[PDB]
């Protein structure tokens, strides 16, 4: 290891993933297993990569105190055990799901998704992101307007209104 010369290191070096941070997630991992690194690191194979890091650095005094790069409301955002996660390339979508559709399956606590940066707020997960590049969600998103949204009601008077 090393003192300040090493402490400062883990800081700025990784805090760069905060200044120029794509997405953002804070998940504790009490009772985490190796699959913990056989997942966010496995999905990094044929659907991710070295573009993701969850360097458990909840040293707070290091992680939290180490975020002068504007991330207010975080003097609270850094409680107990933590394992921050950030992105560099790619979009700012998916990622939340790697956690949302993993930790939801036991896989240790998920900090109930305390939310992180980007919009900069508090706790209460969202998902308006992973719907990206799933353009067909913007396709049927018109609900055929005329069609479907019609053949669903304007023609429901027959299979549900003839008495």
């Amino acid at each position: 290891m090393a003192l300040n010369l090493q402490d400062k290191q883990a800081i700025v070096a990784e805090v760069s993933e905060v200044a120029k941070g794509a997405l953002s997630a804070v998940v504790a991992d009490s009772r985490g297993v190796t699959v913990d690194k056989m997942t966010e690191l496995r999905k990094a194979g044929r659907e991710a990569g070295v573009y993701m890091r969850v360097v458990r650095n909840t040293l707070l005094r290091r992680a939290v105190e180490g975020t002068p790069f504007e991330c207010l409301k975080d003097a609270f955002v850094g409680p107990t055990l933590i394992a921050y996660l950030m992105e560099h390339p790619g979009a700012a979508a998916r990622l939340f799901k790697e956690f949302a559709k993993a930790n939801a399956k036991f896989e240790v606590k998920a900090a109930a998704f305390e939310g992180e940066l980007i919009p900069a707020s508090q706790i209460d997960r969202l998902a308006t992101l992973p719907t990206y590049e799933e353009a067909i969600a913007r396709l049927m998103a018109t609900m055929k307007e005329a069609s479907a949204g019609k053949l669903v009601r304007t023609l429901a008077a027959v299979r549900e209104a003839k008495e």
């Binding site: 699959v35 056989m38 690191l41 496995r42 194979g45 044929r46 991710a48 990569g49 070295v50």
Partner: protein
Amino acid sequence: AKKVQAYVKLQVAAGMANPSPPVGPALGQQGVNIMEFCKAFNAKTDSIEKGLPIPVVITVYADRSFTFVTKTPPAAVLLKKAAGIKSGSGKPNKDKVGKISRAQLQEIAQTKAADMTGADIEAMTRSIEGTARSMGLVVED
């Protein structure tokens, strides 16, 4: 995945399935028959070739037989058919034995697709970078 329920890996060659002299009564004893470990093995082994190492897991429950799902082979045994001499170690690093460079064993680091904890398609090349040095084989890379 879970952890451990029942699985091993003992074998000499695919050129001869379910060996009789080798392992013998040492190829499964907790739900593994010895006259059946050749009806689920050669069911897909005879679909590529016979003569190379084939380890595998052994999902065991309590319903007569069992179920398995093997994968990529070791890149150390491929040095008897895709590298040089018949043996391997023996003479370690005491006198430059065989010699494999950057070119050879290249695509041998391309066969293990899903089975390679080396996300970086390029970096995953450093892994097998040793599956041919357990006997001393300087690389002319």
